[PDB]
C-alpha cells in the first residue's frame, strides 16, 4: 500500500533546497511520517507513503503542498504551517491576466507592488496574514481563502496603477474590519 | 453547624459529615460557560471549571440556597441547611444547588 508522487525542481530553487534540505525532510519523515526521496539528477522530489507509516492520505497531499510551496519560493516555516493548518491555500496569477503591460511598465508595477525595501509588500503580509512570492511575472499568495482573496484585492489594486497610499488606506480598512470580527 | 449535624443525625443519616461531603460532590458543576468575545454577538463557550473552583462553587451555591431558604420563614438556618445538605447529598432536585448545578451544566452542554 504505497502511494508515490513526483515533483520537479527548478535550479532557481534548488540551491535553497540543497541548503535547507536537512530541515525539510525529517518533519516529513518523522513529524508527518512520509517516505521522502530525492533524485538530484532529474531534480525530482519523490513523496511515497508505505504500510509502515500512519495511514493518513491527506498527509501525503499536505506534504505535496509543502514541497510545492517551497518550490514556489515560499519560506520554510510558512510551509510548516501549511503542514499544520489546512485552511491555507495558494493563489497564482500573472500580470497580463489583469492588465497588459510592456517593458518598464512591468518593472514599475513590480516595484510598486514591492515598494522600497519591500515595505509595501511586507506591510501586506502583516495585515493580510498571508505570504507572497513575487516571481518574474507570477504572483503567489499563501493563506486563508478570505485572506488570499483580500491579498488578491490588494495586488489587483497595486497592479492597475493605484498609488500605495490608497492601498495603505484600504489595507488598514480591511485589517480593522477583519480583526474586530 | 453543630445543630445541623444533630439534625442530620435525627433525620436518619448516621454519618452527617459524609452527608456534607456528598453534598459537596453531588452539587459541583463539572463544566460551565464563559463569555468569550465572539465578534460582537458574544456567545458563551463551555469551559471545564477547576475542581477547586467546583468546591468553591458548590459551597457558594449551598450557602446562597440556605440563606435564601432561612430568610423570611420560621424554619431555622440549621434546619434549612440540613434539609439542603440531605436533599443535595444525593441528587433529588428538591434542594437549591442540585437545580443550579443542573442549570449550569445544561448551559455548558448546550454551549460547547
Amino acid at each position: 500500500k504505497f502511494e508515490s508522487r513526483k515533483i520537479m525542481v527548478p535550479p532557481h530553487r534548488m540551491t535553497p533546497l540543497r541548503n535547507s534540505w536537512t530541515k525539510i525532510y525529517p518533519p516529513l519523515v518523522e513529524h508527518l511520517k512520509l517516505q521522502v526521496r530525492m533524485n538530484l539528477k532529474t531534480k525530482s522530489v519523490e513523496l511515497r507513503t508505505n504500510p509502515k507509516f500512519t495511514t493518513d492520505p491527506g498527509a501525503l497531499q499536505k506534504g505535496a503542498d509543502f514541497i510545492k510551496a517551497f518550490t514556489l519560493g515560499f519560506d520554510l516555516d510558512d510551509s510548516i504551517a501549511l503542514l499544520r493548518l489546512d485552511d491555507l491555500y495558494i493563489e497564482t496569477f500573472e500580470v497580463k491576466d489583469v492588465k497588459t503591460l510592456t517593458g518598464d511598465h512591468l518593472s514599475r508595477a513590480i516595484g510598486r507592488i514591492a515598494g522600497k525595501d519591500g515595505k509595501t509588500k511586507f506591510a501586506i503580509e502583516n495585515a493580510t496574514r498571508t505570504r507572497i512570492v513575487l516571481a518574474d511575472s507570477k504572483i503567489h499568495i499563501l493563506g486563508g481563502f478570505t485572506h488570499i482573496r483580500m491579498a488578491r484585492e490588494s495586488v489587483v489594486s497595486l497592479i492597475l496603477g493605484s498609488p500605495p497610499g490608497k492601498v495603505y488606506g484600504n489595507l488598514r480598512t480591511v485589517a480593522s474590519r477583519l480583526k474586530e470580527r | 453547624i453543630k445543630h445541623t449535624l444533630d439534625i442530620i443525625n435525627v433525620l436518619t443519616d448516621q454519618n452527617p459529615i459524609q452527608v456534607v461531603v456528598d453534598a459537596i460532590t453531588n452539587t459541583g458543576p463539572r463544566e460551565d460557560t464563559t463569555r468569550v468575545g465572539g465578534g460582537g454577538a458574544a456567545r458563551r463557550q463551555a469551559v471545564d471549571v477547576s475542581p477547586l473552583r467546583r468546591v468553591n462553587q458548590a459551597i457558594a451555591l449551598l450557602t446562597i440556597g440556605a440563606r435564601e431558604a432561612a430568610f423570611r420563614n420560621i424554619k431555622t438556618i440549621a434546619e434549612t441547611l440540613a434539609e439542603e445538605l440531605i436533599n443535595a447529598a444525593k441528587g433529588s432536585s428538591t434542594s437549591y444547588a442540585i437545580k443550579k448545578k443542573d442549570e449550569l451544566e445544561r448551559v455548558a452542554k448546550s454551549n460547547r
Binding site: 501525503l60 491576466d97 481563502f145 | -
Partner: protein
C-alpha cells in the same frame, strides 16, 4: 488492480467543476458542482464547497465502484488565469482525503500560442 477513471477539475473564478469520466472520455460518471452543494451565494466556489462536491464525487464513484482516477486539473485558460485555483487544490485535498486511488496528477491548462484581445480593455478588467 483498480478501475482507472479520468478526473477533470475546472476552476472558474466563481465555480469548481469535478468531472469523472471513463477511459477515452466515454461518459460522465460522477459530476456535481459547488453551486449545487452549498446554497450560500457567497460560498459558491469556496474550498469548503469544493471539498463537499469532491466528497460527493468520491461517494458516487464508490457507488459505481470505480476507485482509480487519472486526474486532470484545469484552469480557465484561454485569456484568463492559467493556474487552477484553490478550489481545485481543496478538491484534490478532498479526493486524497476520501481515500480514492490516484493514478496520476496532471495540470492540463489550455495555453494559447498567441492570444486575441481580452475582455479587459486597455484599462484592466477587474477591480
Amino acid at each position: 488492480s483498480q478501475v482507472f477513471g479520468v478526473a477533470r477539475i475546472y476552476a472558474s473564478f466563481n465555480d469548481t467543476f469535478v468531472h469523472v469520466t471513463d477511459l477515452s472520455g466515454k461518459e460522465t460518471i460522477a459530476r456535481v458542482t459547488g453551486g449545487m452543494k452549498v446554497k450560500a451565494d457567497r460560498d459558491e466556489s469556496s474550498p469548503y464547497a469544493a471539498m463537499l462536491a469532491a466528497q460527493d464525487v468520491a461517494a458516487k464513484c464508490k457507488e459505481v465502484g470505480i476507485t482509480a482516477v487519472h486526474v486532470k486539473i484545469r484552469a480557465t485558460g484561454g485569456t484568463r488565469t492559467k493556474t487552477p485555483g484553490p478550489g481545485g487544490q481543496a478538491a484534490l485535498r478532498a479526493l486524497a482525503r476520501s481515500g480514492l486511488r490516484i493514478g496520476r496528477i496532471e495540470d492540463v491548462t489550455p495555453v494559447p500560442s498567441d492570444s486575441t484581445r481580452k475582455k479587459g480593455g486597455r484599462r484592466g478588467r477587474r477591480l
